[PDB]
Structure 1
């Protein structure tokens, strides 16, 4: 039928894996870090480590780990233009890994237009449909932002809201249908809310550290997370 059974679904869910953040405490919040068949969001301040984490994950997501997770090829659609292979080859070190590999290991794609963006989304599917199980993370940073551009003033939001969810929906059907992990950043019942299943909010704790809280995500803990950042990606904050 147009839909399956409960057992049959619980059959699928046995594939829900988590890509780590390198910040154990942080991972604890997401009960293991980034999740699959789910879009994770990055709420941040003008200067936030999200664009930093993205790189991290560009690699945590290549290192087999927790709950028998393999690791794999990733897709980094960049709108902002903050992608830094250099930052990558730098992280692959904290995890002692071949550089050319880590890079050979990610798939880069710069977004320019609110149309170009989905031009890519609808493509990503294709590369996911060809061969699956190779690609474990579809990281788009940032999604909105480029949409806050090709709008037609505070008067044509009617096209923005409509157009946005036109793919932000198509983005869900990728996540749970092809089974992957979609990390997304931005700065906003807001359409891009029920859309993203897990919403992480970020605040700075004085340069070194940062505090990641949950705005809204199934089984959301009231407690906060204390993670640190370095050249080697995101990591736990020590004494």
Structure 2
């Protein structure tokens, strides 16, 4: 399992994020999502005995919120080489769903070509909403979203990777495709609350977590 960077959020997840999975983390804006993604992108490169997946992260950025500075701040927390981390977090930025899907044509081929522990498509649902903004586009946007999810699930099952998609509450097949779902909601200061909203195995349960120079860390207070 890959560490979220919080042992207590990992204990809510019963050992951390799962290699061979799709995860969706959701609720309001600013509820951990991008900082979880940056933390995972680094920590997945750790030994499995150290709490990683022994492999690279793809980071598909839908939004421009990707930062090498936040990757370096997490790399040095775990004594990882900063510049190798910046290369092992394979960066690609997309303003739209067709380029997001073209980056899954690249990533489903390219993930053969190194050991990857993770793939991130941060804020994926925002591209669907801003590209398929015409209300009537329901069946097409849902089946493009289902195509995208099946490509991510192919990546998860084919490479044994954890796969990460993030959602701001502002389509529902994400809940079916997600192996554990996290309803992340508001906390106090840079602290935040995690709830497991859905898993077929794990119950409804909760944990506090923190956003620091650590990346994501335990909310010891």
TM-score, normalisation: structure 1: 0.85
How much does 1:230 deviate?
0.2
Which stretches of structure 1, 4 residues or longer, exceed 6 Å deviation after superposition?
none
Match of 2:97 in 1: 114
Q: CA RMSD in A?
A: 1.9
Partner of 2:124: 143
1:62 maps onto 2:45 in alignment: yes
Match of 2:32 in 1: 49
Paired residue secondary structure (1:124): helix
Aligned to 1:13: none
Shift of residue 117, structure 1, vs aligned partner: 0.8
- TM-score, normalising length from structure 2? 0.92
Q: Deviations over 1:191-232 (max 9, x none)?
A: 111112211111122113211011111322333111111011
Gap regions ≥5 residues in structure 2: none
Contact 1:34 1:183 in 2 (8 A): no
Structure 1 position 29, deviation (Å): 1.6
* CA deviations over 1:71-119 (Å, ceiling 9, x no partner): 2211000001100101111121221222212212210001122111111
1:201 has 2:178 as partner: no
Larger radius of gyration: 1
Choose 137-146 or 214-223, whichever is displaced more: 214-223
**SS where residue 175 of structure 1 aligns?**
helix
Partners of 2:24 and 2:72 lie apart in 1 by: 25
CA distance, structure 2, for counterparts of residue 184 and residue 115 of structure 1: 16
User: 1: CA distance between counterparts of 2:80 and 2:145?
Assistant: 38
SS of 1:159 mapped into structure 2: helix
Aligned to 2:154: 173
The corresponding residue for 2:2 is 19
Identify which of 47, 56, 64 aligns with 1:81.
64
Provide, for residues 160-194 of structure 1, a one-character-per-residue CA deviation record: whole Å limited to 9, x for no partner. Answer: 11211122112211111221110110124921111
Distance 1:138 1:209 in 2: 25
Alpha-carbon distance between aligned partners in 2 of 1:155 and 1:62, rounded to the nearest angstrom: 42
